[PDB]
Amino acid sequence: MYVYPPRIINGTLYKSTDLAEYTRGKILQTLSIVRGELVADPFFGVPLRLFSNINDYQSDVSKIQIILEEEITEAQFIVTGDLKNNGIVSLTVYWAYLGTENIENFEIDTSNI
Amino acid sequence: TTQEFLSKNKTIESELLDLLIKPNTDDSILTRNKQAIADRDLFDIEWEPGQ
Numbered sequence A: 001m002y003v004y005p006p007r008i009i010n011g012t013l014y015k016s017t018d019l020a021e022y023t024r025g026k027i028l029q030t031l032s033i034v035r036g037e038l039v040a041d042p043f044f045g046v047p048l049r050l051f052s053n054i055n056d057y058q059s060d061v062s063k064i065q066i067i068l069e070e071e072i073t074e075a076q077f078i079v080t081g082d083l084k085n086n087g088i089v090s091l092t093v094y095w096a097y098l099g100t101e102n103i104e105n106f107e108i109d110t111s112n113i
Numbered sequence B: 001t002t003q004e005f006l007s008k009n010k011t012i013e014s015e016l017l018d019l020l021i022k023p024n025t026d027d028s029i030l031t032r033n034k035q036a037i038a039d040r041d042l043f044d045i046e047w048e049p050g051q
Helices: A019-032 A059-071
Strands: A075-083 A089-097
Touching: A019 A059, A019 A089, A059 A075, A059 A089
Parallel strands: none
Antiparallel strands: A075 A089
16 A cells, blocks of 8 residues: 655655554644645544644644544544643654554664655 | 368367366365455464463
8 A cells, every 4th residue: 555655765656565654654644634635525634723822722632633533443542732832732642553562663764765 | 981071270169168177266175265354353463472
């Protein structure tokens, strides 16, 4: 299968047999698409709220967690939000691939692109 | 009386039995496990001592 980020490696599209990095690519694709980006599906994508005071900053985290859980059924998602110094809201998505039982390392990460 | 026959190239009567060898995959000891299950229902586990 073709993982989300289109990279031409060795003259062809990067095809991966493993389902674990394919699931990771699915997570990256879901998080990289803002709701409304796609013309076919105007509802798929994470909701983005950028310029607003940091009072209700957990509800969007919960919405992102729910969207990740509904869209990707092969992984379990826990999303946490931290408040940084200037204006940064740090989201951390803890995901585990249900097919595997241990942490699965990918060799394409070590390769220098 | 005996009829004489000379070499031909392609007859309909030979094409009635041109079929002789069939490479099928029907129930047999070598075709029991036709269906394999993908990773959607498999767990990848490591082999530990005492396993």
